[PDB]
Ligand binder design. Structure first.
Ligand SMILES: OC[C@@H]1[C@@H](O)[C@H](O)[C@@H](O)CN1CCCCCCNc1cc(-c2cccnn2)cc(C2CC2)c1
Length: 763
């Protein structure tokens, strides 16, 4: 409880809006939020096209991301904007104190690059909103006639934050001056503030709100006879009339000519004295020092990646992953019809389920909150369930208490049945980035339970103030156990939910196997896809069939039982632990009985024939390796040995750039959208690397084969992601096994960041 409050207080504030370039919000649904906008202005019509706010990635943006980051302390982001001729730095720092989650400060620095006109005009906006019924926020008016010569102070209060002040400092840089007539009514040019109110639920719509203000300014020009015969300069046409006051929205606008910088200082009143700029500079310097010392300990890169080039790389991949952390809040779109069509018990079920979907019974429910890292700032900045399992593996190394918060956050979404939606789209802001057709979540749709892998890591660590807090759940064995005590029932709920909702059919067919009980089938497959497995278009039995069994799914259930054995034990859930043991033992047998192909030398999914018999359907690739990847096979297993041969075999899976998702010998290799049908994916390569190492560091017949494969695969995977990063500045979603090129999505940090841990080794 004491550790709990110290964690809460520690993690409350951050730049938890990874969907925008730079903004802040605390981990409270309805509260104070800030966000940055900037754009060059060269004409009367360009600013609407140049202005930056929500993250994107196109030819106008060289790249962006976190150089250093730690959600407890803060960090530094670099933004390389080609369109706007600007290299921007955003430094953010947290200053503990008081009773309301502390203070914070940020510095916004813009440096024109060599290509930009030295006299560029850049509009900068700091947009501040506050949601809540009994809360207040007011801009203190300036002394000067038409705007502010120096600092802008907002005073506010709420129940969550108590009293606070938020200051936007004068900053440094040339502020352009207009000789136009308009300057008699609008000033020659200066910082301005508009203070406004809108219904709370739209405050997130910062760009439209700003533009509506800009447009009203222009309408006033037109009305008041400022015209094309003699027009004010663009930057002055686009500078709002100063109108500070009280409201739930405050727009702070500046125009700078040339290079600029300014500070934002949030001062919690319950803390000591207020935050100054000199405080900002010191806390930033200190944060870097600490970041440096922790990285070197937690991620000590081993040969042959000990060099500085690899260090910078690891720092980038890590900082982007942990820097993705957001806080999301709002309603989600869910079909709670539980239409019987979703049971998928008939042949041709996909058409039935489509019919049900076409009823559109989904409705908004919640609100929910989620504190999570994310795969992709520009393209999908939101929680994905099996992704988060991988994200937290390096995060847990860094700060186990952080990882546990995020696990806890995820589990608090689970409904009464044991279901967590695979994709968390929370609130109208998150929804804006997502077509309607893809918002709806389905209570029968699972996703791999990869969060158990993180739990497994914590368990091993448990058995063997920002520095202290990071590791309080391991350094106090009782803290750890209580966490496990409270989560355990939800883990069990999820286990049972898998076995209720994703059950395969043994008893109803000509099917023999050691267990009558253990068989699984992912719900939600279409003719070409199986989105729930995580391996979108990996080839599965055709056509899809209520008789299908999926070897990956059963392996995940294996992962789950094993975790439950260890957690069950620690809590002395004797009766539970006996039941799990029997489940484990049956999965071990049934994987062989239902999924092993002796003819093919690997595991395979299964269906039933035109003639009602169990047929194996083998497509050599990631799926085929699943019992090995999930840690389920004995190190002396002949089956394992056969998979090692498949893994190392260049004509099948082994490319110079890592393991191919699908074999070059498979008929579906490089077909269709070719998503999981040949490319190299880091998440699955990471599981391979870890399992190879496990076998390499243990007595057995495959020790030396495993050592060789581990050595090379680690090399191949790290070097592929490193070369791509070096060339392009990006982590990529997947890598081309023929060319080694990164392809699909950039800014995928994202499980590609697992490469930090691969380099650091010592599993
Ligand atoms: O990592 C999560 C999952 C994993 O769980 C799965 O295992 C894995 O199979 C797929 N990934 C990703 C699945 C995300 C589906 C939604 C993406 N929609 C989207 C794509 C792009 C885009 C632009 C350019 C190039 N390509 N794409 C742009 C937008 C826009 C805001 C405008 C949205």
């Amino acid at each position: 409880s004491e550790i709990g409050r110290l964690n809460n207080q520690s993690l409350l504030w951050g730049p938890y809006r990874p969907n925008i370039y730079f903004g802040t919000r605390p981990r409270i649904g309805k509260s104070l939020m800030t966000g940055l906008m900037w754009g060059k202005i060269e004409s009367y019509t360009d600013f609407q096209h140049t202005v930056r706010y929500t993250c994107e990635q196109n030819e106008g943006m060289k790249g962006y991301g976190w150089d250093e980051y730690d959600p407890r302390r803060g960090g530094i982001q670099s933004i390389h904007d080609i369109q706007n001729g600007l290299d921007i730095t955003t430094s953010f720092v947290k200053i503990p104190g008081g009773a309301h989650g502390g203070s914070w400060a940020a510095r916004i620095k813009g440096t024109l690059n060599d290509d930009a006109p030295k006299d560029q005009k850049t509009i900068v906006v700091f947009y501040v909103s506050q949601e809540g019924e009994n809360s207040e926020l007011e801009a203190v008016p300036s002394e000067n006639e038409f705007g502010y010569e120096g600092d802008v102070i907002l005073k506010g209060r709420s129940e969550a934050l108590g009293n606070y002040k938020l200051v936007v400092t004068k900053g440094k840089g040339v502020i352009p001056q207009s000789d136009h007539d308009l300057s008699r009514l609008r000033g020659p040019g200066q910082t301005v503030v508009q203070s406004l109110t809108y219904p709370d639920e739209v405050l997130w719509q910062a760009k439209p709100i700003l533009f509506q203000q800009l447009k009203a300014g222009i309408d006033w020009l037109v009305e008041n006879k400022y015209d094309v015969a003699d027009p004010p300069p663009p930057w002055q046409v686009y500078l709002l009339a100063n109108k500070p006051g009280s409201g739930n929205v405050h727009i702070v606008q500046k125009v700078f000519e040339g290079d600029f910088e300014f500070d934002i200082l949030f001062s919690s009143e319950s803390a000591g004295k207020e935050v100054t700029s000199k405080d900002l500079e010191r806390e930033v310097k200190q944060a870097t020092e600490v970041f440096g010392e922790r990285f070197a300990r937690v991620f000590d890169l081993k040969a042959p990646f000990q060099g500085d080039n690899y260090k910078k790389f690891g720092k980038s991949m890590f900082s982007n992953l942990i820097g993705g952390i957001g806080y999301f809040y709002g309603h989600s779109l869910v079909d709670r019809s539980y239409a019987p069509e979703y049971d998928e018990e008939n042949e041709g079920f996909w058409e039935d389920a489509a019919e049900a979907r076409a009823r559109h019974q989904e409705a908004l429910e919640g609100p929910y909150e989620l504190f999570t890292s994310i795969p992709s700032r520009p393209f999908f900045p939101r929680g994905f369930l099996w992704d988060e399992g991988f994200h937290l593996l390096p995060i847990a190394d860094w700060d186990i208490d952080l990882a546990l918060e995020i696990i806890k956050s995820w589990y608090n979404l689970m409904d009464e049945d044991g279901w967590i939606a695979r994709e968390q789209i929370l609130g109208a802001e998150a929804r804006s980035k997502v077509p309607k057709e893809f918002q709806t979540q389905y209570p029968h749709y699972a996703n791999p339970p990869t969060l158990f892998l993180v739990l497994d890591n914590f368990v091993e660590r448990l058995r063997k103030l920002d520095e202290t807090l990071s590791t309080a759940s391991v350094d106090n064995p009782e803290v750890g156990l209580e966490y496990l005590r409270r989560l355990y029932p939800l883990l069990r709920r999820q286990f049972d939910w898998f076995r209720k909702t994703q059950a395969g059919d043994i008893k109803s067919y000509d099917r023999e196997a050691y267990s009558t009980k253990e068989a699984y089938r992912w719900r939600g497959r279409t003719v070409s896809h199986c989105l729930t497995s995580g391996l979108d278009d990996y080839p599965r039995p055709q056509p899809p069939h209520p008789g299908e069994l999926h070897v990956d799914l059963m392996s995940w259930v294996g992962v789950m039982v094993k975790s439950l054995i260890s957690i069950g034990s620690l809590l002395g859930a004797t009766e539970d632990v006996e039941f799990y043991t029997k489940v484990l033992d049956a999965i071990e047998h049934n994987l062989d009985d239902l999924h092993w192909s002796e003819k093919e030398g690997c595991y395979c999914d299964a269906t039933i024939d035109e003639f009602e018999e169990h047929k194996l359907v083998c497509h050599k690739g990631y799926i085929s390796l699943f019992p090995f990847l999930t840690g389920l096979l004995k190190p002396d297993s002949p089956k394992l040995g056969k998979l090692l041969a498949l893994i190392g075999d260049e004509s099948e899976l082994w490319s110079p750039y890592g393991l191919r998702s699908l074999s070059k010998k498979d008929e579906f290799y490089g077909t269709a959208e070719n998503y999981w049908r040949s490319p190299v994916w880091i998440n699955i390569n990471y599981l391979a690397i870890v399992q190879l190492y496990n076998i390499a560091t243990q007595d057995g017949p495959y020790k030396e084969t495993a050592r060789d494969l581990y050595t090379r695969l680690r090399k191949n995977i790290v070097e592929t992601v490193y070369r791509n990063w070096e060339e392009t500045g990006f982590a990529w979603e997947q890598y081309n096994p023929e060319t080694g090129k990164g392809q699909r999505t950039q800014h995928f940090t994202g499980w590609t960041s697992l490469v930090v841990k691969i380099m650091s080794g010592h599993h």
